[model samples]
Target: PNFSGNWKIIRSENFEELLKVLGVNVMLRKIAVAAASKPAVEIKQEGDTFYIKTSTTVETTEINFKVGEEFEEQTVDGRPCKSLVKWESENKMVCEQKLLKGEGPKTSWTLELTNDGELIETMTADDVVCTKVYVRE
Candidate 1:
C-alpha cells in the first residue's frame, strides 16, 4: 500500500511519556495533549521523494526528503534534528531522527499500515514508545 494520503489522528497512546522522555517541558506537553483540534498527517510521494506535513491548531510543520537521504528537520514540538527515512516495505517505513542538541537521544518512528487500513505511527525515544493511530478519509 502507498502511504501517500492525508491521515487524521484517531488516538494516541503514551504520547506524553514520549515527549517527556524527549525532555519537552510540561507546559508544551500539556498544550500538545490538549490541543483543540486533532492533528492530521499529510504525505505526498513521488518516486523516492516525499513531502510530509503535520497540522494542528497550533501550527503546521512540514519536511521534504528523499528516501535514504538525510535532511535537517524541525520537529513538531520545535526540536531541531537530522532525519532519515527508509523503507521497510511498500506498506511500512521507518524514520530516525537524531536530535542535534547536546547528545540528545535518537528517536525512531516506525510508520506502518494495518490490515484494517489504519495508519500506525510508533515512536521511540530513550526506550519509551508511543503509538498514534490514524484513519484515511
Candidate 2:
C-alpha cells in the first residue's frame, strides 16, 4: 500500500514509557502523550521521496526524506539526530534515528500498512516499545 494519505490515530500503547526512554522530561512527556492521543499524520510519497507531517492540537512536526538516504532531524524535545528511512517492503517502512552526539538511545520505528488497511506505527527505544494504530482520514 502506498503510505500516502491522512491517517488518524485509533489507539496507542506504551507511548509514555517510550518517551521516558527517550529522556523526555516529565512535563513534555505528559503533554505529548495527551496531545498525541488524537493526532493525525499526513503522508505524501513521490517515487523515492516522501514527506510526512504529524499534527495534533498542541503541535505539529514534519519530515521529508528519500528512501535509503540519511537526513538530519530534531526530536520534539529538541534533540538532534541523524535519521534514515528504508523500505522493508511495499507496505512497510523502517525509520532509524541516532542521536548526533552519541549521547542517547538509538531510536527506531516502523510504519506499516496492515492487510486490513490500518497504519501501524511501532516505536522502540531502550527496549521500550510503543504501538499506535491509525486509519485513513
Candidate 3:
C-alpha cells in the first residue's frame, strides 16, 4: 500500500504492443525491450504530493501527481499529457491520462501492489492491454 520503494520490472507481456498502440516509434521500442527495464519506478515524496521516477535505456521521465489533483505525466515515448492518479485501495491505484495531441483511444493504467511486494501494472489504450510485473526492491 505504501508506494515508498523502488520496483524493478522482471517480466512484461505485450509491452511493446501497448507502446506501439500508444504511438511509440520503432527504434525506442527496441531499446526498451530489454529485460529488467525500469519505467523500476521509484516512488518519492514532495511536500504533499507523490512522484515516481522512471528510466529506460533511451529516456528518463518523472511522473508526479497529487491524489485528486490533475497534472501531467510523460509516457515512455516522452509524450506528456494531462493525467490524474487516484488511490483505489490500499494496494491499488487507477490513472487516467489524456494525451496532448494525437488520434487514439483514451489511455489508462493501474498500479496494483500485490502480495509479497509484487507490482502489477496494467496499461490499456486502443484495445491493447499490457501488463508489467515488478518486484519491489
Candidate 4:
C-alpha cells in the first residue's frame, strides 16, 4: 500500500464494541459520535519511512518512523501513553502502545491495505478492538 493518497473514514465496524471493551462510558460514547468526524488522518510514505498526521479541532499529532524501526510515541488525546511501531508486512503496519497513567493498559493499532487499495485501521485496547474503513478521496 503506497498510502500516499488522501482518504476519509466512511464507517466503522465493531467500533462501539471496542469502545465498550475500553470501558468508555455511555456519556463519552455519545460525545464521541459527535467528535468522531472531527479527527482526520493523513499518511504519507517515502521509501521505507512513513509519516502520519492526525488533525482535529482540539489537537494535531504527527508521527514519523521507518519500517522495522522502533520509536517512542505519545497518545494524541489526553491519555498519557507511549508506543512502538513496526511494519508487519509490505501492506500492513502495526503498533503497540502503553498507557502511562491510571491502570495503564497496552493498546495496539494495525493498518492494513485492502485488495481494492483502501486502508483499514484497527485499534485494540483493554480487550476492545475497533475497526475503521477508509476510502480514497
Candidate 5:
C-alpha cells in the first residue's frame, strides 16, 4: 500500500466528455488541456489511510481520506462538496461526491491499479465519463 511517488497521466480518454457534462466551459477546457501536459499527482498510503496531492501550474489540491470513510471535501477549483471514499479492493478505490456549487451534479471517481502497476482513474458525472491513466515514475 505504499503509493508514495510521482505519477504522470499518460493517456486520458473520454475525460473531456465528463468535464463538459459537469459544465466546464470552453476556456476552462482549454486550460485543462494545457494543464494536463504537466499535471502530476502524488499519493501516500498508510494502512487504510491515504493522502493524495494533485498539482498543476494553476493550482494544487490535497485530499485526506481513509478506507470506508466519509468526509466533506472541497473541489480545488470550485466549491465545497460532500464526499465518501472507500477501498473497493486491494488496489482499487471508489469515491462518491455531491457537488455543492454549479449545477449540483453528483460525481464518482474510481481508481484502479492495473496488473502492470499503473493507476487508472475514471470519473463519472451523471451520464458523462472521463478516464485517465497514471504511470509511476
Candidate 6:
C-alpha cells in the first residue's frame, strides 16, 4: 500500500522490444535498453491524484492524474494519449491508456509492490507483454 518510493530497475524483459513494436524511435529504445541505463521509477499518491515518473539517462516520462478521471499525456517515445489510473488493491495499481497521436494499440499497465519489497511492472500492448522489476531505495 505504501507506493511512495524511489524504485530503481534491477531487471527487465521484453520492454524495449515492445517499444519498438509500438514504433518508438530507435534512439529512444537504444537509450532505454543501454547497459549503463539505470531506469528509476517514482510514485506518490495523495487523495485522488497519483503522481508517477520513470527516468533513464536519455529520457523521462511523468504522469499525474486522478483516479477515474481521464487526462491527456505524452510518453517518452512522444506518443500522446488519454489515460486513467486506478488502484486494484492496496499494493497494486492499474492504468488504461488510449493513444491519440498515432497508430498504436491501447495499453494497460499494472504496477505492484510485492510482499518481498520488489516493484513489478507489467505492460501489455499489441502482441507483446513486457515486465520489469525494481527495488526501493
TM-score of each: 0.88, 0.88, 0.82, 0.79, 0.86, 0.83
lDDT of 5 at 137: 89
Please, what are the lDDT tens digits per residue for candidate 1 over residues 24-137? Answer: 899878877885646889988887788989888877878899989999985535678888899999888898888788566657788888878899988887678889999987
Q: Give the whole-model CA lDDT for all candidates, comma-separated.
A: 0.82, 0.82, 0.76, 0.73, 0.76, 0.80
Better of 1 and 6 by TM-score: 1
A best-first ranking of the candidates according to their TM-score comes to 2, 1, 5, 6, 3, 4
Off by over 4 Å in 5: 35-37, 75-77, 100-103
Q: What would the per-residue lDDT of candidate 2 be over residues 1-137, giving only the tens digit for each residue?
A: 68889998888998877777767889878887875446879999898798999788867889999989999987434789888888899888898888887576657888889888799999777577889999987
TM-score of model 5 vs. true structure: 0.86
Alpha carbon deviation, residue 83, candidate 1 (Å): 1.4
User: How big is the positional error of residue 30 in model 4, measured in Å on the Cα after superposition?
Assistant: 2.1
Residue lDDT tens for model 3, 38-129? 56578875543787888766556676688789987765456777888887886788888888887557678888877788888898875788
Sorting all predicted structures by lDDT, with the top scorer first, yields: 2, 1, 6, 5, 3, 4
Better of 3 and 5 by lDDT: 5
Q: Candidate 6 — what's its lDDT? A: 0.80
Worst 10 residues of 1 by lDDT: 99-108
RMSD of each: 1.8, 1.9, 2.6, 2.6, 2.2, 2.2
- Candidate achieving higher TM-score, 4 or 5: 5
